[PDB]
Paper text:
FLASH, Flice-associated huge protein, was originally discovered as a protein involved in Fas-mediated apoptosis and later in regulation of expression of several genes, including oncogenes. Subsequent studies showed that FLASH localizes to Histone Locus Bodies in the nucleus, suggesting a role in expression of histone genes, and that it is essential for histone pre-mRNA processing. Biochemical studies revealed that the interacting N-terminal regions of Lsm11 and FLASH form a docking platform that recruits the HCC to the U7 snRNP. Our crystallographic studies of FLASH NTD demonstrate that residues 71–137 adopt a continuous and stable α-helical fold and mediate the formation of a coiled-coil dimer between two FLASH molecules.
While the electron density did not provide conclusive evidence for the existence of a disulfide bond, and the two sulfur atoms are separated by 3.4 Å distance in the current model, the structure raises the possibility that the observed FLASH NTD dimer might be mediated by a disulfide connection, which is unlikely to occur in the reducing environment in the nucleoplasm, the site of 3’-end processing. To rule out the possibility that the observed FLASH NTD dimer is a crystallographic artifact caused by oxidized cysteine residues, we determined the structures of the FLASH NTD C54S/C83A double mutant in two different crystal forms at 2.1 and 2.6 Å resolution, respectively. In addition to Cys83, we also mutated the other Cys residue in the FLASH NTD, Cys54, in case it formed a disulfide as well even though the residue was disordered in the structure. The two structures adopt the same coiled-coil dimer as the wild-type FLASH NTD, confirming that FLASH NTD dimer formation does not require the Cys83 disulfide. The individual protomers of these two mutant dimers also show differences, similar to those observed for the wild-type dimer. Interestingly, residues 53–70 from one of the protomers in the structure at 2.6 Å resolution are stabilized by crystal packing, showing strong electron density corresponding to an α-helix. The other protomer showed weak electron density for residues 56–62, while residues 51–55 and 63–66 are not observed. These N-terminal residues are disordered in the other two structures. Our AUC results showed that wild-type FLASH NTD and the FLASH NTD C54S/C83A double mutant have similar sedimentation coefficients of 1.61 and 1.59 and frictional ratios of 1.81 and 1.86, consistent with them forming dimers in solution. The Kd values for the wild-type and C54S/C83A NTD dimers are 0.18 and 0.05 μM, respectively.
Author numbering:
A (entry chain B): 70 to 138
B (entry chain A): 71 to 144
The structure:
């Protein structure tokens, strides 16, 4: 049978564990937020790069063909 | 606080910590997927920049050569 003081002791231990666990949760939530932002910007970066690259290669191929013609 | 009130608060703290641990593992799995996906996107971008540069540079030199060939014959 848990005593009144034992419940007070365990409650304090639980708050210390809870504070420690809440710190780790906010940390991994912070990491989640930056990882998602990095994910979305990398997709926007690789998309603009593909468009920039194909546009410039086409334009260069048009010069080469006209010069040959 | 009464003895039963203490049992309740203690039990409630335990249950909040279990709920918190569950959400932690959920988010951790998300971050593992995002780290994996971001690393590959960064390798894609490096590969694509390299190959586009090779193409553009090669195109620039063919354009240069064709202009110099023309002038040399005019």
């Amino acid at each position: 049978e848990a005593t009144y003081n034992d419940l007070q002791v365990e409650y304090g231990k639980a708050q210390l564990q809870m504070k420690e666990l809440m710190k780790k949760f906010k940390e991994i939530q912070a990491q989640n937020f930056s990882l998602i932002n990095e994910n979305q910007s990398l997709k926007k970066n690789i998309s603009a790069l593909i468009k920039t690259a194909r546009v410039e290669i086409n334009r260069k191929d048009e010069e080469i063909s006209n010069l040959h013609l």
